[PDB]
Design a protein around this ligand. Structure first.
Ligand SMILES: *[C@@H]1O[C@H](CO)[C@@H](O[C@@H]2O[C@H](CO)[C@@H](O[C@@H]3O[C@H](CO)[C@@H](O)[C@H](O)[C@@H]3O)[C@H](O)[C@H]2NC(C)=O)[C@H](O)[C@H]1NC(C)=O
Ligand SMILES: *[C@@H]1O[C@H](CO)[C@@H](O)[C@H](O)[C@H]1NC(C)=O
Ligand SMILES: *[C@@H]1O[C@H](CO)[C@@H](O)[C@H](O)[C@H]1NC(C)=O
Lengths: 49, 40, 48, 48
């Protein structure tokens, strides 16, 4: 009745891709993908850090 | 005699259809667990 | 919270706010326009 | 005779001339958003 719900700009798929990016960086590269270009590191060694 | 009218005597308060929904209404109803006059 | 607020905002269309109806067509047919102005003003004020 | 939604607005009717069920949907409405490049670049526009 004159009320409307507008869509989000990002779809739930895009949020699922961004959270997968955030996660894939967090897994493969430590904090480095925040601080600069993502640098790969073995996950056991990221844990030792 | 007397008898307990357990959970009974509700009826469709309007000719509306409502689907799978917990509607609420004010109307003349037999009070739940009231005390009906039983005749032999 | 959002569903309750939206459903409240919708239910408030049906409230009279001291007008002779909450249905705008009733006000536009149970009165002449110069009296209906007050009834619409009450509904506008309430809805607003 | 007629259906209501969760907000008790009418959602369907039975046709009294022949007893099939008509679902009632609102008449369509929405914002005319205009997409534009900068006017300091073009005068072409797109309407959403
Ligand atoms: C008010 O209701 C009556 C009863 O339905 C309408 O008359 C006709 O009644 C029959 C039996 O109920 C309907 O079924 C069949 O329809 C097919 C259509 O292809 C026809 O081949 C069959 O011989 C049989 O008639 C029929 O649909 C129904 N309607 C019509 C227009 O015939 C009556 O028409 C309604 N009142 C008014 C003022 O129209
Ligand atoms: C119903 O009324 C009779 C007689 O007054 C009484 O014995 C009985 O306890 C009442 N039952 C209830 C449910 O109040
Ligand atoms: C605005 O338009 C003028 C040409 O009409 C151009 O010189 C200027 O660089 C433009 N500025 C921007 C920010 O596009």
């Amino acid at each position: 009745n004159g009320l409307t719900v507008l869509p989000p700009l990002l779809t739930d798929e895009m949020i699922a891709q961004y959270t997968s990016a955030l996660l894939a960086g967090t897994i493969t590269s430590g904090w480095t993908f925040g601080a600069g270009a993502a640098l790969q590191i073995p996950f056991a060694m990221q844990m030792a850090y | 005699a007397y008898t307990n009218s357990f959970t009974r005597g509700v009826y469709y308060p309007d000719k509306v259809f409502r689907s799978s929904v917990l509607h609420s209404t004010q109307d003349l109803f037999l009070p739940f667990f009231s005390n009906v006059t039983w005749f032999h | 919270q959002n569903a309750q607020a939206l459903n409240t905002l919708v239910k408030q269309l049906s409230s009279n706010f001291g007008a002779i109806s909450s249905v705008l067509n009733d006000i536009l047919s149970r009165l002449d326009p110069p009296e209906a102005e007050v009834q619409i003003d009450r509904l506008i004020t309430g809805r607003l | 005779q007629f259906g209501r939604d969760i907000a008790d607005t009418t959602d369907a009717v039975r046709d009294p001339q022949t007893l099939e069920i008509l679902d009632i949907t609102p008449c369509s409405f929405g914002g005319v958003s205009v997409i534009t490049p900068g006017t300091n670049t073009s005068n072409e526009v797109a309407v959403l």
